Design a protein around this ligand. Structure first.
Ligand SMILES: CCCCCCCCCCCCCCCCCC(=O)OC[C@H](COP(=O)([O-])OCC(O)COP(=O)([O-])OC[C@@H](COC(=O)CCCCCCCCCCCCCCCCC)OC(=O)CCCCCCCCCCCCCCCCC)OC(=O)CCCCCCCCCCCCCCCCC
Ligand code: BCL
Ligand code: BCL
Ligand SMILES: C/C=C1/c2cc3[nH]c4c(c3C)C(=O)[C@H](C(=O)OC)c4c3nc(cc4[nH]c(cc(n2)[C@@H]1C)c(C(C)=O)c4C)[C@@H](C)[C@@H]3CCC(=O)OC/C=C(\C)CCC[C@H](C)CCC[C@H](C)CCCC(C)C
Ligand SMILES: C/C=C1/c2cc3[nH]c4c(c3C)C(=O)[C@H](C(=O)OC)c4c3nc(cc4[nH]c(cc(n2)[C@@H]1C)c(C(C)=O)c4C)[C@@H](C)[C@@H]3CCC(=O)OC/C=C(\C)CCC[C@H](C)CCC[C@H](C)CCCC(C)C
Ligand SMILES: CCCCCCCCCCCCCCCCCC(=O)OC[C@H](COP(=O)([O-])OCC[N+](C)(C)C)OC(=O)CCCCCCCCCCCCCCCCC
Ligand SMILES: CCCCCCCCCCCCCCCCCC(=O)OC[C@H](COP(=O)([O-])OCC[N+](C)(C)C)OC(=O)CCCCCCCCCCCCCCCCC
Ligand SMILES: COC(C)(C)C/C=C/C(C)=C/C=C/C(C)=C/C=C/C(C)=C/C=C/C=C(C)/C=C/C=C(\C)CC/C=C(\C)CCC=C(C)C
Ligand SMILES: COC(C)(C)C/C=C/C(C)=C/C=C/C(C)=C/C=C/C(C)=C/C=C/C=C(C)/C=C/C=C(\C)CC/C=C(\C)CCC=C(C)C
Ligand SMILES: COC(C)(C)C/C=C/C(C)=C/C=C/C(C)=C/C=C/C(C)=C/C=C\C=C(C)\C=C\C=C(/C)CC/C=C(\C)CCC=C(C)C
Ligand SMILES: COC(C)(C)C/C=C/C(C)=C/C=C/C(C)=C/C=C/C(C)=C\C=C\C=C(C)\C=C\C=C(/C)CC/C=C(\C)CCC=C(C)C
Ligand SMILES: [Fe+2]
Lengths: 52, 247, 305, 54, 281, 44, 50, 46, 54, 44, 45, 54, 54, 54
């Protein structure tokens, strides 16, 4: 049944699309924090490594 | 005492830390045993006692003397549900949910459950009813919020279900507890104040749809509400969230 | 959508004077004003407050302690209101110098006035503890508040009275300042190695984080089940309702085990008295038994060595 | 000595058996860890030195 | 297996992902979709911690430490034995925490209660993510995060604090500490009061909430109530964690010097900057 | 016939046929991508 | 829809920022702006208009 | 594979498909980040 | 050995299959990460060394 | 005669038959992969 | 008498234990063969 | 020791089977990790040294 | 002096017995640790010096 | 002294037995740890020195 095939595809796509939206949203958030750290004067004032 | 060890590296700090570990084990045992005074012994899903009961033994009974001659309560003790539960097994093996036989909000199972509390009103420290309608409460008035009396009541289905006529107030705490809502048929129902949002020109009840307002359990005496009636009302209204999701 | 964080309607009636179990009603005051802000968050009524003999003692001694510290701060400011406001948080009453030991011969400018203020504070705090005990007794209640306060007092006594005597010097004690007692804690950790490596420091921090964890958990649970009248817990103990059952089942389905409406309060009281008790022990051990906590950790398998 | 069976009248067998199993396993693990911590009874190092496994 | 009242609450509904699939219990625990996810992530993290202990060469649980990548790696991958395992464990810990919160949401909506507990947990997850993700990402490297060890993450705390002199001169730090201390005090008082009402002098009747109200009105002249005390506890805990997250996020990103030097803006206010007296004059 | 799901035997057979079809198509796509990557830069 | 309290809070925040920049320029220091703006914003937000 | 289809009389096909889509996407992401973290195969670097 | 089918008389296949899938995937990922952690059997670095990619 | 799941004797026997089929298929794939790895790079 | 906590009779307990012992002995035999292989490969005594 | 089957009248087989499966898996992982921690029994390193892999 | 038995009509025997046992054991352990801390009375060191176990 | 059995009319025999077992095991472990920490009476090191296993 072709409708059965397309329904399986639709459920698979729903799961994959929800997961991808979440993961890419997190990746965008990481890029946001990275860019706003680039604008900050962190490059001038750099802290020492706290793990010894 | 600096550097003074009894043996090895064992000094007063080591003695203190090991003493504390032993004390903490004993205290955790005591705390869990005191936690074990309700809902035990554990049961099978067919009601019989469970073969496995847990590492912690059941505590000795202790007795509360209830105020106002309400009696005593000994816990742990023989506790029965004392009400029929309209649920059916969906699997022979344990660990699976039980399905409602009929109307879960009517039958009072799941998120619509209620407990067979005492059929008496809760009392304050003087013996009077703790909760009273604001008309019965002498000297009470709405102080500093949006007064809900007269506002239309709207269910989750965008339709009007009645109007607020009175506020039921907790006299000792001086806080509002229930909203008395008159329906189309001239009958009043009580809505928990924690379950309604008082907006500028309406009161919104997200848990319950407009028709379902008719099925809220009523109070047998207009001037007071007992603990059993509070459980019935609150269970129904809370179960509306799961069992009124369609419409 | 209503999260029950703030009241949306507020009602007022006659003020509640309270119970009359065996309290001496002549020692009470009248009811104070009602407050609408407190009504938004909690109860609006202020008062009546009980003030008996132990209350007079506590008020006098605490007032004298506060006044002594304030007058010293005014002396340090040069009696200048502008300097007093500017260098507030920088003034301090210092304890005697280490040369004087435990003796009471230190001058007023050096450490004597610190001793006077400390006597006033000692009397005030012990009389307040007695007041909590007697206020619990008058109403017929148990004395759980008194013993939890005794735990807190134990840490306060170790910090200010017991450890200086074991160390043999009043200079070991805490100054009366805002930034000064912070500098005191930093220097205490530095002189004694690393206070992170004090194991009772670690237990005290565990129980502080545990108080925050537990009481966020418990406040959230009571707010979540308050649609069933869960906040009236004293009657959920006497008459278990659907609120207590739902709370227990939430925590049992989540983390495998649960509590009662009363056992959770036993957990709470113990989780807080433990932070203060373990802290007292850890401070008493510092300097008297262990002078360097990092080396102790190296000898006890906690640091790489 | 012939009346020790009456201990099962005092104590519930289920909890006794569970606690005994946990205690026995933990005691065996503790003794094994103690032996592994001593250089003269760590059988893995002893085998590594008897057979020339540098 | 079940509590004496548990049976009527175990009903088929309230899931977020899946349906009757994963809608069952394992003993006391509820295991939905996010129960499976939580178990997977937590087991993976724990095994990876043990394997890092194998790599490091120690079996002492107080000496086991999993270190972030060195600063030379920036915000990129690292070799597994030199910071990759820390990154994998961080991903597993984040997944375990978020799946735990979502499982709690599923339980909340199966029982018909409000979602206060998952929200409160999300505050702690955000504090952890501030320490492990947001601050390192702004600062430019994964090596500004803390290691996964019982006594070495305390070394991270000590070094990070002492980079900026004495750390409790940070103002948001002061607010967070005040909230933490106040919360512990409130928790002790609340537990003691409830117990004392429920456990009066021997042979007495149980006290009522009126007796509790009277006890604190006699003591301090004000009683906040039961609803009030629970709201206060929730907000005190959340405000403590929020202000701790803030004081750390502003620490290496906006501030760079000793905080005791930050407090000089109040002293150098123009109208008392030069008055000759006191401490700073 | 345990039947915890409500599908009969024939419904399960038909659905499994379509699911196998999809699984093999996905396998072919993954295989061709792997062959491309292996030609570009082998990992053995 | 938005509540009257919510509107008061939005406008209190914008008034806080505005008056803060305003009186941080007028006075020589940002603390003057913070104090004046926070007092005005608190007074504005504590008095909902309904 | 004679009678593997009977797995669909054990589990709901819709929910299995959604969960399997989630699993496949997360597995792909895992493998891709494993590849990126390596100095070689980092196609963005080249 | 021929009587092992009676394991399904104790355990419902749904929970067992869920747990078995979780366990098997976890074990596979664990073994792969252990192999990637070692200089040898890190097939990516082995390939890089063999083809002089550096 | 003992029953905890509601499966009959034959139902459990058939479930075990197909479960063994899947287990043996999975194990055969595992052996082939292990033989390939061992030929590629032995660990003994 | 029976002294039953799980509701199993004697016959059900015997049949269950027989099958359990079969499984235990198979597991143990596999472990023994594994230990023989390891010991030939690298003895630890 | 001919009456050991009566343990199944004390303990429910399903609880026992689950708990012992967890115990056996964890014990196996523990012993393997111990052997991997020992340089003279870390078979990965042994094979790398035997076949001259650096 | 012959009426001290009357103490048992104002104190409950269970409380007294538990407190007495805890107190006695703690006191004895404290004294033993004090003696072990002092080199003059550390019998494990005195015996070692007597029989030259060093 | 022949009337010590009456302690069992004061103390619950089951609580006593559990407390006593925990007490006895903890005391035994503590004494063994004390003996292991003294270089004389550490039987493993004594055997190692006796048989020249270092
Ligand atoms: C071998 C070493 C290991 C040692 C232990 C190992 C043994 C095995 C494990 C044993 C552990 C068992 C734990 C279970 C206890 C739980 C009991 C309970 O909560 O309810 C029962 C009972 C009341 O239950 P209830 O049902 O609520 O009663 C209602 C009543 O009807 C009406 O109410 P009420 O009027 O009767 O009173 C209510 C209150 C009542 O309970 C009490 O009365 C507690 C009494 C105060 C504590 C005693 C210390 C005070 C100083 C002594 C002077 C006063 C002594 C006389 C007390 C008067 C009693 C008549 O009940 C409470 O729940 C209060 C809870 C909070 C108590 C916190 C007390 C901390 C004070 C801090 C003191 C710091 C100074 C020294 C610090 C240590 C020095 C290094 O409460 C208690 O018995 C409390 C026990 C107090 C424990 C004290 C702490 C020990 C600290 C040791 C730390 C570890 C040492 C490491 C350092 C070593 C350095 C070298
Ligand atoms: C919060 C700001 C700092 C920090 C500062 C400190 C300081 C300072 C101290 C600790 C201490 C502890 N910290 Mg830390 N800690 C941080 C982040 C963490 C995280 C995390 C994933 O975010 C975890 C799990 C821990 C874990 C721990 C415990 C080892 C210990 C007691 C905590 C406790 O009981 O809390 C309350 C929670 C409970 C009571 C519930 C039970 C939680 C149990 C105890 C956690 C065990 C975790 C286990 C060791 C590891 C995972 C497997 N820390 C960050 C970097 N932490 C103390 C200690 O003793 O360290 C040696 C200590 O002195
Ligand atoms: C550089 C600084 C050092 C350090 C130095 C110290 C020292 C020194 C001490 C602590 C102590 C504590 N530290 Mg430390 N601490 C460090 C790092 C940390 C970190 C961290 C994340 O880095 C954390 C979470 C903590 C946490 C803790 C607490 C668990 C503990 C204090 C309990 C308390 O409530 O005290 C506050 C409560 C009190 C003092 C009790 C007060 C009770 C009395 C009765 C109140 C009287 C009030 C008076 C009458 C008021 C009038 C008021 C008006 C009526 C309004 N520390 C580092 C390593 N810390 C203490 C402790 O116990 O350690 C073992 C301690 O002494
Ligand atoms: C479990 C451990 C916690 C805990 C415990 C408890 N703490 C208690 C009780 C319990 C149980 C009480 O029952 C009692 C009380 O009544 O509560 C309402 C008390 C109090 N804890 C105070 C202060 C405090 N607790 C702190 C910490 C914690 N405490 C820790 C976390 C901290 C810090 C630094 O964090 C501070 C500053 C006072 C408000 C008050 C005594 C007033 C006094 O002594 O007045 C006497 C002094 C005066 C009247 C001086 C007044 C001076 C002028 C007029 C101004
Ligand atoms: C914001 C206000 C407070 C707050 C609030 C709340 N907190 C909650 C809840 C609420 C409301 C819950 O509902 C939830 C819960 O159910 O409670 C019983 C939870 C929980 N709070 C935990 C720990 C905790 N809360 C802390 C802090 C506060 N909490 C703050 C102060 C601290 C510290 C350091 O202070 C700690 C350690 C766990 C016990 C539990 C999560 C279990 C989990 O997620 O399991 C799933 C994960 C595991 C079982 C293990 C995963 C292991 C990873 C892979 C490896 C990790 C290694 C690690 C990095 C090594 C470090 C060394
Ligand atoms: C998990 C922590 C709680 C464990 C408590 C278990 C328990 O109470 O035992 C009850 C079980 C019996 O179960 P029970 O169902 O009869 O409960 C007995 C009730 N009390 C506690 C009052 C006795 O007792 C035993 O296990 C035998 C104890 C006798 C010898 C004790 C040796 C202990 C060794 C300590 C190792 C450290
Ligand atoms: C170590 C100690 C282990 C303690 C666990 C005790 C288990 C008891 C229990 O709650 O049963 C749950 C539940 C409870 O069973 P129940 O709900 O059917 O009934 C309980 C029994 N009575 C009737 C007495 C109430 O059992 C299951 O959920 C079965 C799920 C399938 C499990 C199949 C066997 C798995 C064996 C483990 C293999 C995987 C090993 C992974 C190791 C860990 C990996 C990180
Ligand atoms: C650190 O330690 C290291 C990693 C170094 C080594 C330590 C290692 C360990 C501890 C390894 C563990 C090895 C184990 C214990 C492996 C377990 C392997 C198993 C038990 C695999 C199971 C394979 C079974 C499989 C795939 C399932 C086949 C099942 C099927 C397709 C489904 C059956 C289809 C059905 C049933 C229809 C039924 C329905 C009706 C109506 C009849
Ligand atoms: C650090 O210390 C080290 C690790 C170095 C050394 C210390 C070591 C220790 C402490 C080692 C512990 C070794 C132990 C204690 C091992 C336990 C081994 C056991 C006891 C294994 C049990 C194996 C049982 C097995 C596989 C079960 C086979 C069972 C079956 C299939 C179940 C069949 C039974 C059935 C099905 C019911 C069917 C019948 C009916 C009527 C339905
Ligand atoms: C205009 O403003 C006026 C002048 C009207 C008043 C304003 C006043 C101010 C600015 C007051 C300042 C109050 C402050 C800043 C207080 C600081 C209080 C602190 C923060 C204390 C911090 C740690 C203190 C600790 C542990 C104290 C422990 C003290 C003790 C146990 C007491 C020990 C008692 C004993 C030492 C001495 C024994 C001698 C005799 C005779 C018993
Ligand atoms: C750290 O670990 C690393 C990363 C190093 C490696 C470890 C790796 C593992 C252990 C990976 C696990 C791989 C597995 C176990 C993968 C399972 C793959 C499966 C079972 C895929 C099945 C996909 C089924 C698919 C696409 C079919 C969905 C069916 C459909 C839409 C219906 C078809 C409709 C159609 C065809 C007509 C087309 C138009
Ligand atoms: Fe509470």
């Amino acid at each position: 049944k072709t409708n059965l095939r397309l329904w399986v595809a639709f459920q698979m796509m729903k799961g994959a699309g929800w997961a991808g939206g979440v993961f890419f949203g997190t990746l965008l958030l990481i890029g946001f924090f990275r860019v706003v750290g680039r604008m900050l004067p962190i490059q001038e004032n750099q802290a020492p490594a706290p793990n010894i | 005492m600096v550097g003074v060890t009894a043996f090895g590296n064992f000094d007063l700090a080591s003695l203190a830390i090991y003493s504390f570990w032993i004390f903490l084990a004993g205290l955790i045992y005591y705390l869990q045993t005191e936690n074990m005074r309700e809902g035990y012994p554990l049961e099978n899903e067919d009601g019989t006692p469970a073969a496995n009961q847990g590492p912690f033994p059941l505590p000795k009974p202790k007795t509360f003397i209830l105020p106002h001659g309400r009696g005593t309560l000994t816990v742990p003790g023989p506790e029965s549900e004392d009400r029929p539960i309209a649920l059916a097994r969906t699997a022979v093996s344990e660990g699976f949910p039980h399905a409602p036989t009929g109307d879960p909000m009517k039958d009072g199972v799941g998120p619509a459950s209620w407990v067979a509390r005492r059929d008496l009103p809760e009392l304050d420290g003087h013996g009077h009813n703790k909760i009273k309608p604001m008309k019965a409460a002498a000297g009470f008035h709405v102080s500093a919020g949006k007064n809900p009396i007269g506002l239309p009541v709207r269910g989750c289905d965008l339709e009007i279900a009645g109007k607020v006529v009175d506020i039921w107030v907790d006299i000792p705490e001086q806080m509002a507890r229930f909203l008395e809502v008159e329906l189309k048929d001239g009958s009043t129902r009580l809505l928990p104040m924690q379950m309604v949002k008082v907006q500028s020109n309406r009161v919104h009840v997200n848990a319950l749809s407009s028709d379902l307002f008719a099925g809220i359990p009523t109070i047998k005496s207009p001037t007071e509400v007992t603990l059993l009636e509070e459980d019935k009302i609150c269970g129904y209204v809370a179960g509306g969230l799961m069992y009124a999701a369609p419409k | 959508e209503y999260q029950n964080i703030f009241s949306q309607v507020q009602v007022r009636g006659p003020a509640d004077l309270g119970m009359t179990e065996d309290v001496n009603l002549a020692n009470r005051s009248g009811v104070g004003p009602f407050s609408t802000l407190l009504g938004w968050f909690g109860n609006a009524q202020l008062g009546p407050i009980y003030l008996g003999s132990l209350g007079v003692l506590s008020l006098f001694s605490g007032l004298m302690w506060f006044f002594t510290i304030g007058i010293w701060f005014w002396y340090q400011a040069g009696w200048n209101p502008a300097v007093f406001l500017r260098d507030l948080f920088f003034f301090s009453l210092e304890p005697p110098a280490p040369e004087y030991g435990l003796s009471f011969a230190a001058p007023l400018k050096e450490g004597g006035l610190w001793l006077i203020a400390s006597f006033f504070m000692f009397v005030a705090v012990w009389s307040w503890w007695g007041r909590t005990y007697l206020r619990a007794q008058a109403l017929g209640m148990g004395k759980h508040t008194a013993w939890a306060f005794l735990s807190a007092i134990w840490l306060w006594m170790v910090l200010g009275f017991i450890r200086p005597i074991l160390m043999g010097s009043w200079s070991e004690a805490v100054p009366y300042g805002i930034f000064s007692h912070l500098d005191w804690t930093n220097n205490f950790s530095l002189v004694h190695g690393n206070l992170f490596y004090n194991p009772f420091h670690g237990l005290s921090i565990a129980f502080l984080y545990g108080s925050a964890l537990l009481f966020a958990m418990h406040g959230a649970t009571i707010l979540a089940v308050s649609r069933f009248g869960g906040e009236r817990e004293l009657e959920q103990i006497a008459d278990r309702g659907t609120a207590a059952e739902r709370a227990a089942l939430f925590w049992r389905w989540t983390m495998g085990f649960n509590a009662t409406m009363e056992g959770i309060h036993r957990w709470a009281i113990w989780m807080a008295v433990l932070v203060t008790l373990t802290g007292g022990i850890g401070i008493l051990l510092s300097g008297t038994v262990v002078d360097n906590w990092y080396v102790w950790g190296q000898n006890h398998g906690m640091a790489p060595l | 000595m012939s009346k020790f069976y009456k201990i099962w009248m005092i104590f519930d067998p289920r909890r006794v058996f569970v606690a005994q199993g946990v205690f026995l396993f933990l005691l065996a693990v503790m003794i094994h860890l103690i032996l592994l911590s001593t250089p003269s009874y760590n059988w893995l190092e002893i085998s590594a030195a008897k057979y020339n496994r540098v | 297996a079940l509590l004496s009242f548990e049976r009527k609450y175990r009903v088929p509904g309230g899931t977020l992902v899946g349906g009757n699939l994963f809608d069952f219990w394992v003993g006391p625990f509820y295991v939905g979709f996010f129960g499976v996810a939580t178990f997977f992530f937590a087991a993976l993290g724990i095994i990876l911690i043990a394997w890092s202990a194998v790599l490091q060469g120690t079996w002492n649980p107080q000496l086991i430490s999993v270190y972030p990548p060195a600063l030379e790696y920036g915000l990129g991958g690292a070799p597994l034995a030199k910071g990759g395992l820390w990154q994998i464990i961080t991903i597993c810990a984040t997944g375990a925490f978020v799946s735990w919160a979502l499982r709690e949401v599923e339980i909340c909506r199966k029982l018909g209660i409000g979602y206060h507990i998952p929200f409160a947990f999300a505050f702690a997850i955000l504090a952890y993510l501030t320490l492990v993700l947001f601050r390192p990402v702004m600062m430019g490297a994964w090596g500004y995060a803390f290691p996964y060890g019982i006594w070495t993450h305390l070394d991270w705390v000590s070094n990070t604090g002492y980079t900026y002199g004495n750390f409790h001169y940070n103002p948001a730090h002061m607010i967070a500490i005040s909230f933490f201390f106040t919360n512990a005090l409130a928790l002790a008082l609340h537990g003691a009061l409830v117990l004392s009402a429920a456990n009066p002098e021997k042979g007495k009747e149980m006290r009522t909430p009126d007796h509790e109200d009277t006890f604190f009105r006699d003591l301090v002249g004000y009683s906040i109530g039961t609803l009030g005390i629970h709201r206060l506890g929730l907000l005190l805990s959340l405000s403590a964690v929020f202000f701790s997250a803030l004081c750390m996020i502003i620490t290496g990103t906006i501030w760079f010097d000793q905080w005791v030097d930050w407090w000089q803006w109040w002293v150098k206010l123009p109208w008392w900057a030069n008055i000759p007296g006191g401490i700073n004059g | 016939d345990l039947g915890y799901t409500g599908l009969t035997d024939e419904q399960a057979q038909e659905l499994h046929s379509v699911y196998m079809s999809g699984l093999w198509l996905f396998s072919a796509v993954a295989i061709v991508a792997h062959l491309a990557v292996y030609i570009w830069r082998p990992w053995f | 829809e938005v509540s009257e309290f919510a509107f008061r809070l939005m406008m209190a925040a914008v008034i806080f920022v505005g008056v803060g920049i305003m009186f941080a320029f007028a006075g020589g220091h940002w603390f003057v702006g913070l104090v004046v703006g926070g007092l005005v914003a608190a007074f504005f937000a504590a008095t909902p208009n309904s």
